[PDB]
Amino acid sequence: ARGPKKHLKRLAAPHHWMLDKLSGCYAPRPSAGPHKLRESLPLIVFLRNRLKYALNGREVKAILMQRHVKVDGKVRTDTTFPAGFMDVITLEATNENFRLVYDVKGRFAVHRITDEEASYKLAKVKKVQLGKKGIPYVVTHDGRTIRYPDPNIKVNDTVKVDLATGTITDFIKFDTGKLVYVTGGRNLGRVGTIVHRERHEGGFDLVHIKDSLENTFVTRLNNVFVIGEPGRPWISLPKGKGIKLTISEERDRRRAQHGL
Amino acid sequence: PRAPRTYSKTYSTPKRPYESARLDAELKLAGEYGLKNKREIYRISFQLSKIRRAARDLLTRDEKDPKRLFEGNALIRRLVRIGVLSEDKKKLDYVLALKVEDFLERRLQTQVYKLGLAKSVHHARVLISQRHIAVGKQIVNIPSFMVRLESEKHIDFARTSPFGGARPGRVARKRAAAAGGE
Amino acid sequence: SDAITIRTRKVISNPLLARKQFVVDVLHPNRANVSKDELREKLAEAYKAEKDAVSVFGFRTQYGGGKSTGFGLVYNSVADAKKFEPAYRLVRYGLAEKVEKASRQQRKQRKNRGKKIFGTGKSIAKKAARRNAD
RNA sequence: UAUCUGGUUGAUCCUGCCAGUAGUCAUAUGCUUGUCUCAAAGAUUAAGCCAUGCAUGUCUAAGUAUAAGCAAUUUAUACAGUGAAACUGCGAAUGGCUCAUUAAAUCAGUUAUCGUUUAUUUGAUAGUUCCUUUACUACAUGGAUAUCUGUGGUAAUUCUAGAG
RNA sequence: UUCAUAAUAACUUUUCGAAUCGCAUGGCCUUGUGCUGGCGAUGGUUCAUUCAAAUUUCUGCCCUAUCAACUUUCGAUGGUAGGAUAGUGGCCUACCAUGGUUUCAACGGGUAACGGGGAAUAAGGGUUCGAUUCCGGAGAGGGAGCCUGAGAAACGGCUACCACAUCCAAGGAAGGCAGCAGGCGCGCAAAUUACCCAAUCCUAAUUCAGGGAGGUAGUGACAAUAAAUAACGAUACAGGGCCCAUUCGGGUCUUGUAAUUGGAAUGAGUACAAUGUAAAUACCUUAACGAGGAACAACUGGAGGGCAAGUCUGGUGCCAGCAGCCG
Ligand SMILES: [Mg+2]
Ligand SMILES: [Mg+2]
Ligand SMILES: [Mg+2]
Ligand SMILES: [Mg+2]
Ligand SMILES: [Mg+2]
Ligand SMILES: [Mg+2]
Ligand SMILES: [Mg+2]
Ligand SMILES: [Mg+2]
Ligand SMILES: [Mg+2]
Ligand SMILES: [Mg+2]
Ligand SMILES: [Mg+2]
Ligand SMILES: [Mg+2]
Ligand SMILES: [Mg+2]
Ligand SMILES: [Mg+2]
Ligand SMILES: [Mg+2]
Ligand SMILES: [Mg+2]
Ligand SMILES: [Mg+2]
Ligand SMILES: [Mg+2]
Ligand SMILES: [Mg+2]
Ligand SMILES: [Mg+2]
Ligand SMILES: [Mg+2]
Ligand SMILES: [Mg+2]
Ligand SMILES: [Mg+2]
Ligand SMILES: [Mg+2]
Ligand SMILES: [Mg+2]
Ligand SMILES: [Mg+2]
Ligand SMILES: [Mg+2]
Ligand SMILES: [Mg+2]
Ligand SMILES: [Mg+2]
Ligand SMILES: [Mg+2]
Ligand SMILES: [Mg+2]
Ligand SMILES: [Mg+2]
Ligand SMILES: [Mg+2]
């Protein structure tokens, strides 16, 4: 290819958009935006598929055009906008508010979350740098560039953007014994506590995570998103809280909780 | 360029195609259950071979192993739900002991014959093929409809069929019209 | 003993499109399919709405007759149904008219013919006429 | 889905292959062919040659309107409606097809860019353009230019020269 | 880290720092066209982020020694400086050093070789295939060269040569199907100049326009699934479990064979409709028709062995022919 690629064939779309392998040759390629397309979620997928509020492409276009979708307090009238992790989608119709958090199967689950907390958003600090005229600034995972941050905010840390002014409200410092979320690999959706963070001089940090069920795994640091203090998450965790029940345990859940 | 959907073969002809004893056994099973071809016996043997392959693979695995537990009891419950494996022997070692005749027995053909609403096996075949038997107010024109245990109690002639109560049909209606005219 | 009975399953309200979506489950023994217009009317006085703000499609009389299943929408107003529905549904229901369109091949031919001429064809016509004059 | 059988000899035990057997999202072909679902399909030889027709153009309330285009009616002294054409902007480098070249080449897995460019999308981002400031358009600086009006040329091509 | 950033001295044929559009046109009264004033749309420098793009580390490739040495004057391996690059880099130049690979198969030759995810096959180990639905790469007749842009060495963009060609008023002009159709040729070998933006999406100033991308149909025994071609009686010719066995024999109890014989059921087809679809086919449903030789008629191979089934009839007589092998 000579230049950028602008088509996403259906099989090549991520298995987390988890579309239908039939009924279409192509899949919505997310336009450039705040999130990686492999990690993001187009608005058309979130509305037509996840919510079923629409039926097809024209309906999603009509929905977005009339300015009822509000991604993080902004309209975002483009069909393939990459609404990524921890973004907030507001529909004044049905007065509903969603926050995108992976369900433990590892998918962008529909999370109806309250209006009061929908005012703010969480973010991971991916860079802390000194821009022109000696002005410190911080780059989050959304690509948001927050100017004049707290002087002791470091990389891999987490922050609580007020999402109205777009400035820093509070922040959480990365360290052991801290509630944490996972955003990549087999451990998608898993939530736990940081037990240890082995350094590995030369690259590719690893952290060990122990969840409430007392199960333990290990994940890359790029893959990690501190979410609060144990017992006190800073957001509303989805149904199941990412315990990753075993397949037999899931079968027992299906058998036990069963009413028809 | 659209994503293909996977067709897959469902039978396997035997390597020795000309075995006298095997041919006689196949004809016995065809005549006992009114099978149209001998591809039916091949299909049931292929299904049984897949089942046995899964059972033996799970048997090789160690006892009390999550794979063994999960898929072994999944296969057990599926087979008892079909009805071929009796509830007495849900052990995954009697799964290897099933015979092709066992799956043959659960066909909607033989079930309609057993219930007695069809008095002959070929009568059951034709009655199924004439859109008469309905498994839960839903007709099945297919002899190989594997009747499961939970639903065998709901086989009867459909309402749209004359047997379940409706207009008789072409020949009877024509004869009645002829009698009324003359 | 006709008694066409109707049901709306999985109904979801939707002020995003000012509609109400549902799957139409119509039980009709000793009868063929339900002839959409009639079922549109049935839903019309079912949901206290006019026969114009109601749409049905995607129907499938299941194997063996009797039950049938489709998709249906009820719009808050006839105007919203006019301004939100596809043109082909507005043609099916008689609330709009088929647009006078030339065939695709003719449209493409005319597009290329317009390509041939730079600017309006006013000057070239008279120029060619006086050209073949001499 | 751990299986073999016929053939060297008057007869036997072997080595051995030929043949048989069952496949084949491996094609071709022959003879037949009633139904539902599904579906490959000028790859193999010729990445050989192509008539013909299409396959990429695009306008929102929001760049430019004096079409001597349409509407002239309830909104109209610059302009508002709709809107050809053309200038401007953007894409045309995506998609689709084929496997000819290519044997550490491509490619796969795994790294690196503290070795670089990046329209667009998203988040931020600038007082100084004064230069000796006691004489400047900032209540808005200049000229062309297509579209169009008319004159042509060539047998013809998405050929365009002259004038306003 | 000579990084981020800051500071000093300077430098520039001095980049940017809004002379641009839409809607609403509020507030202050300094009551004038006065002062201010909201929501957007386009731009715009830099830094990030995203879509990426270029390079890039380790390991992995089929056959061949009837290919054992290969590379360097023309870059071959390295050094330094410069040029060019967006940037590292013999990438190129200048001057030096004479180096780099190789029996762990280098180099050369062949590939009816694009690589891979995968396919067939299947006790286990493997063998063969992978042009093609996804990811990469390369190409647009073979070659080179280049403008525009962020991105092309683009070819439904240009320039030239070679090959092949077209209209020609003989001066000139115009070419690129390995895009969708279709044609010639080739060969054993492969489809209709069809409908349409409904669905998936994509492009654009952006809902509306466009899209042979794509979907729908046409042909289609490539492959794959389910499955019709009859079913049941009442009669005549029969056979087995028989009450015993006076010969019997009722057939006492059943199972077949007969151009006898009856009543049912049903599609494969047609077809009111309606559903389906962008519109139509087609399927699902269903009126009205639609089975008696139910002519609504199932073929393809074989009958010595391997290998299921004839030492029946007629014909030919080591002919004709059959035979994968033995015959
Ligand atoms: Mg491409
Ligand atoms: Mg073996
Ligand atoms: Mg010998
Ligand atoms: Mg002999
Ligand atoms: Mg062989
Ligand atoms: Mg039919
Ligand atoms: Mg070819
Ligand atoms: Mg243009
Ligand atoms: Mg206008
Ligand atoms: Mg080579
Ligand atoms: Mg520096
Ligand atoms: Mg250098
Ligand atoms: Mg290959
Ligand atoms: Mg080749
Ligand atoms: Mg390939
Ligand atoms: Mg080839
Ligand atoms: Mg490809
Ligand atoms: Mg190319
Ligand atoms: Mg060619
Ligand atoms: Mg551009
Ligand atoms: Mg080229
Ligand atoms: Mg072309
Ligand atoms: Mg191209
Ligand atoms: Mg060109
Ligand atoms: Mg073609
Ligand atoms: Mg195509
Ligand atoms: Mg063919
Ligand atoms: Mg056909
Ligand atoms: Mg027939
Ligand atoms: Mg025959
Ligand atoms: Mg013969
Ligand atoms: Mg014969
Ligand atoms: Mg035999």
- Closest by Cα among A249, A195, A240, A245 to A218: A195
CA-CA distance, C113 to A249, in Å (whole number)? Answer: 69
- Closest by Cα among C20, C14, C18, C11 to A94: C14
DSSP state of A53: S
Token pair belonging to B30: 């065809």
Token pair belonging to B111: 């079930």
Map out the domains of chain C with their CATH numbers: 1-134 (3.30.70.3370)
CA end-to-end span of chain B: 65
CA-CA distance, C133 to C61, in Å (whole number)? Answer: 69
CA-CA distance, A213 to A106, in Å (whole number)? Answer: 18
CB contact under 8 A, A94 and C13: yes
Q: Could you give the angle at which helices A247-256 and B66-82 cross, rounded to 10 degrees?
A: 40
Backbone torsion region of residue C119, taken as left when φ is above 0, otherwise alpha when ψ lies between -120 and 50, otherwise beta: left
CA-CA distance, B68 to B60, in Å (whole number)? Answer: 9
Q: Count Cβ atoms within 10 A of the Cβ of residue C132 and give its class: 0-12 exposed, 13-18 middle, 19 or more buried.
A: exposed
The answer on A184 and A104 residing in a single domain is: no
E92 C1' to A3 CA distance, Å:
28
C72, C24 Cβ separation under 8 angstroms: yes
CB contact under 8 A, B139 and C63: yes
C43 CA to centre of own chain: 18
E45 C1' to A144 CA distance, Å:
19
Q: Count Cβ atoms within 10 A of the Cβ of residue C68 and give its class: 0-12 exposed, 13-18 middle, 19 or more buried.
A: buried
CA-CA distance, A17 to A42, in Å (whole number)? Answer: 9
B119, containing H or E segment: none
CA-CA distance, A128 to A115, in Å (whole number)? Answer: 31
Token pair belonging to B95: 């799964």
B61 CA to centre of own chain: 31
- Closest by Cα among A78, A56, A186, B166 to C84: A56
Helix or strand or coil: residue A188?
Answer: coil
Q: To which residue do tokens 């065809």 refer?
A: B30
Distance C43 CA to ligand 9 centre (A): 41
Query: To what resolution in angstroms was this structure determined?
Result: 3.3
CATH number at residue A65: 3.10.290.10
Q: Which domain holds residue B168?
A: 17-182
A10, containing H or E segment: none
Token pair belonging to C3: 């008694």
Per DSSP, which regions of chain B are E strands?
133-135, 155-157
Q: Count Cβ atoms within 10 A of the Cβ of residue A47 and give its class: 0-12 exposed, 13-18 middle, 19 or more buried.
A: buried
The answer on A58 and A152 residing in a single domain is: no
- Beta-carbon contacts of residue C134 (< 8 Å; ≥ 6 apart): none
Residue A224, domain member (yes or no): yes
CA-CA distance, A31 to A80, in Å (whole number)? Answer: 6
Helix or strand or coil: residue A145?
Answer: strand
The answer on A167 and A178 residing in a single domain is: no
Residue B87, domain member (yes or no): yes
Tell how many helices (H) and how many strands (E) occur in chain B: 8, 2
Q: Mind telling me how many Å the CA of B143 is from chain C's nearest CA?
A: 16
DSSP state of B107: S
The answer on A8 and A86 residing in a single domain is: yes
B3: nearest CB among A10, A247, A251: A10
CA-CA distance, C31 to A109, in Å (whole number)? Answer: 43
The answer on A136 and A111 residing in a single domain is: no
In whole angstroms, how large is the CA radius of gyration of chain C?
25
CA-CA distance, A137 to C20, in Å (whole number)? Answer: 48
CA-CA distance, C55 to C32, in Å (whole number)? Answer: 20
Residue B8, domain member (yes or no): no
Other Cβ atoms less than 10 A from the Cβ of B81: the count is 13
Q: Does B181 touch chain A (CB under 8 A)?
A: no
A47 CA to centre of own chain: 16
Token pair belonging to A218: 């290990």
Token pair belonging to B163: 């047997």
CB contact under 8 A, A58 and C86: yes
Give strand pairing partners of A123.
Answer: A159
Residue B132, domain member (yes or no): yes
A60, containing H or E segment: helix A57-65
Distance A12 CA to ligand 22 centre (A): 28
Residue B4, domain member (yes or no): no
**In chain A, which residue's Cα lies nearest the Cα of C18?**
A93
Angle (CA) A155-A156-A161 rounded to 5° is 90
Question: Which bases along strand E come within 7 Å of a protein CB atom?
Answer: 4-6, 46-53, 133-138, 150-155, 194-203, 206-208, 210-215, 223-233, 263-267, 272-279, 284-287, 289-291, 307-309
Question: Which bases along strand D come within 7 Å of a protein CB atom?
Answer: 1, 3, 21-25, 38-40, 53-55, 57, 84-86, 92-97, 111-112, 119-125, 146-154, 156, 158-160
Amino acid letter for position A31? S
Residue A42, domain member (yes or no): yes
Q: To which residue do tokens 């629409």 refer?
A: A54
**In chain C, which residue's Cα lies nearest the Cα of A68?**
C16
B44, B104 Cβ separation under 8 angstroms: yes
CA-CA distance, B161 to B134, in Å (whole number)? Answer: 10
Residue B69, domain member (yes or no): yes
- Full 3-state SS string of C38-85: HHHHHHHHHCCCCCCCEEEEEEEECCCCCEEEEEEEEECCHHHHHHHC
Token pair belonging to B158: 């459909």
Distances (CA, A) of C4 to A257, C26, C30, C34, C42: 37, 7, 10, 8, 10
* Structural domains of chain B, count: 1
CATH number at residue A224: 2.30.30.30
Residue B10, domain member (yes or no): no
Other Cβ atoms less than 10 A from the Cβ of A152: the count is 8
Distances (CA, A) of A53 to B80, B130, C56: 41, 43, 17
Q: To which residue do tokens 């590995």 refer?
A: A200
DSSP state of C23: E
In whole angstroms, how large is the CA radius of gyration of chain B?
21
C15, containing H or E segment: none
The answer on A87 and A53 residing in a single domain is: yes
CA-CA distance, B48 to B100, in Å (whole number)? Answer: 7
Token pair belonging to C93: 């229901």
What is the per-residue DSSP string for A27-41?
E-PPPSSSS-TTT--
Q: Which residues of C touch A94 (CB under 8 A)?
A: 13-16
CATH number at residue A167: 2.40.50.740
Helix or strand or coil: residue B72?
Answer: helix
Residue A257, domain member (yes or no): no
Q: Which domain holds residue A159?
A: 121-171
Residue B5, domain member (yes or no): no
The answer on A101 and A62 residing in a single domain is: yes
Helix, strand and coil percent figures for chain C, each rounded to 5:
35, 25, 35
Q: Count Cβ atoms within 10 A of the Cβ of residue A63 and give its class: 0-12 exposed, 13-18 middle, 19 or more buried.
A: buried
- Closest by Cα among A21, A10, A71, A65 to A46: A71
Residue A128, domain member (yes or no): yes
A164, containing H or E segment: none
* Structural domains of chain A, count: 3
- Beta-carbon contacts of residue A171 (< 8 Å; ≥ 6 apart): A125, A150, A153, A157, A158, A159, A160
- Closest by Cα among A165, A161, A139 to A234: A161
Contacts of residues B30-38 at CB distance under 8 Å and 24 or more positions apart, as own/partner, are B32/B104, B32/B121, B33/B104, B33/B107, B33/B109, B33/B110, B33/B121, B34/B109, B34/B121, B34/B122, B34/B124, B34/B125, B34/B143, B36/B125
Q: Count Cβ atoms within 10 A of the Cβ of residue C118 and give its class: 0-12 exposed, 13-18 middle, 19 or more buried.
A: exposed
CB contact under 8 A, B158 and C64: yes
Residue A41, domain member (yes or no): yes
Residue A252, domain member (yes or no): no
Amino acid letter for position A212? S
CA-CA distance, C99 to C108, in Å (whole number)? Answer: 18
Token pair belonging to A250: 């899931």
B138: nearest CB among C29, C30, C64: C64
Token pair belonging to A47: 């509305």
CA-CA distance, B77 to B103, in Å (whole number)? Answer: 15
A246, containing H or E segment: none
Q: To which residue do tokens 């392959």 refer?
A: B53
**In chain C, which residue's Cα lies nearest the Cα of B160?**
C30
Give strand pairing partners of A90.
Answer: A70, A97
A145-147/A26-27 β-pairing: unpaired
C77, C70 Cβ separation under 8 angstroms: no
- Beta-carbon contacts of residue A257 (< 8 Å; ≥ 6 apart): none
Residue A34, domain member (yes or no): yes
The answer on A32 and A54 residing in a single domain is: yes
Residue A253, domain member (yes or no): no
Q: Does B1 touch chain A (CB under 8 A)?
A: yes
CA-CA distance, A196 to C106, in Å (whole number)? Answer: 71
Q: To which residue do tokens 């069920």 refer?
A: A213
- Full 3-state SS string of A120-143: CEEEEEEEEEEEHHHEEEEEECCC
Distances (CA, A) of C97 to C58, C87, C92: 21, 9, 9
